[PDB]
Amino acid sequence: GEAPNQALLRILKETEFKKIKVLGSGAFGTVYKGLWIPEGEKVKIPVAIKELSPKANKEILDEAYVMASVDNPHVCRLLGICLTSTVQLIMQLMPFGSLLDYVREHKDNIGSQYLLNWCVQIAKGMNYLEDRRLVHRDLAARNVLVKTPQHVKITDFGRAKLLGAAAAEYHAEGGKVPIKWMALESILHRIYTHQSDVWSYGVTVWELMTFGSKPYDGIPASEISSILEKGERLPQPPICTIDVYMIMVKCWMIDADSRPKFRELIIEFSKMARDPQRYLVIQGDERMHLPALMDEEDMDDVVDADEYLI
Numbered sequence: 519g520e521a522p523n524q525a526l527l528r529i530l531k532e533t534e535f536k537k538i539k540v541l542g543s544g545a546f547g548t549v550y551k552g553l554w555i556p557e558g559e560k561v562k563i564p565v566a567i568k569e570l571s572p573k574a575n576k577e578i579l580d581e582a583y584v585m586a587s588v589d590n591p592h593v594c595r596l597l598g599i600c601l602t603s604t605v606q607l608i609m610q611l612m613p614f615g616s617l618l619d620y621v622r623e624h625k626d627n628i629g630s631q632y633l634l635n636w637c638v639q640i641a642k643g644m645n646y647l648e649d650r651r652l653v654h655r656d657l658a659a660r661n662v663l664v665k666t667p668q669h670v671k672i673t674d675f676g677r678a679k680l681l682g683a684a685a686a687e688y689h690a691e692g693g694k695v696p697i698k699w700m701a702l703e704s705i706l707h708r709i710y711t712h713q714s715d716v717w718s719y720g721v722t723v724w725e726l727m728t729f730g731s732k733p734y735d736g737i738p739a740s741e742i743s744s745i746l747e748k749g750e751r752l753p754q755p756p757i758c759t760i761d762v763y764m765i766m767v768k769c770w771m772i773d774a775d776s777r778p779k780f781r782e783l784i785i786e787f788s789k790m791a792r793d794p795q796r797y798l799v800i801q802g803d804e805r806m807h808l809p810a811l812m813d814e815e816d817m818d819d820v821v822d823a824d825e826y827l828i
């Protein structure tokens with residue numbers, strides 16, 4: 519069939535980590551900024567802790583399953599889970615937040631080199647997920663986090679599906695889905711593949727190149743499947759040369775097999791990242807620059823999760 523998934527699921531002691539401040543609260547629960555100090559190791563690891571219904575527990579454990587099974591510099595990984603009266607996911611702290619919020623807040627100091635590098639990094643992350651036979655199903659700028667302005671990672675595996683041994687697609691049930699990011703065949707037939715992820719990657723790039731605009735703003739999601747069928751697509755962002763826009767457009771072909779592969783998106787955006795001002799036209803580009811967080815003073819032993827292995 520397929521290879522055995524030998525990922526380790528680490529179970530953490532609640533006394534080993536300290537919540538410092540709330541980062542966000544919603545129906546997903548409450549995310550805290552915090553520190554994880556595994557007993558006896560003399561490391562302090564900055565973490566986000568997602569604290570949390572018996573079906574809502576089955577949902578967060580599926581996410582933990584997926585996150586524990588990935589290991590790539592451009593994908594967020596799970597440090598572990600804690601099974602208290604509520605279930606908590608402990609993941610790497612990504613101090614600059616979501617890329618969608620980052621491009622909105624810093625539109626005036628984001629140059630072409632950052633934008634094209636992020637495109638490369640997300641393609642690398644998605645290519646890795648495809649190698650792992652994983653379909654994300656919710657790729658979007660809100661679901662990419664910023665570790666540093668130079669380093670982003672794909673996150674939010676709440677919808678992700680490992681495709682079975684001989685499965686090329688996944689057929690979902692019904693529910694609330696992110697219509698404005700989805701391939702046409704996913705909207706119409708609830709079918710999802712690596713190539714429908716390519717479609718959402720195209721939409722994600724469009725979000726970045728417009729510094730966080732909302733795709734198909736105002737148009738109700740009811741009408742999206744019809745608009746796409748007529749052959750309409752998102753418009754060329756002002757900063758985009760035709761080279762970059764043609765890549766996005768190719769991600770939105772009706773024939774899924776004629777969309778680019780993630781490994782080709784890596785190559786094409788890497789070429790453009792070598793001469794970024796040739797491919798994105800940003801006023802003031804050549805002079806832009808981008809870069810306590812825990813209210814604790816003795817951070818001598820702090821270690822990023824990426825340097826904390828086994």
Ligand SMILES: C=CC(=O)Nc1cc(Nc2nccc(-c3cn(C)c4ccccc34)n2)c(OC)cc1N(C)CCN(C)C
Pocket residue numbers: 541542543546549551566568609610611612613614615616619623663
């Ligand atoms: C959309 C809001 C957002 O991303 N906020 C955010 C996030 C982090 N870091 C972080 N690192 C890893 C995971 C998460 C995270 C995961 N989930 C599910 C979240 C839900 C809401 C907010 C944050 C998260 N968050 C963070 O680390 C210091 C700070 C912030 N904000 C307070 C700063 C960004 N703000 C301008 C929106």
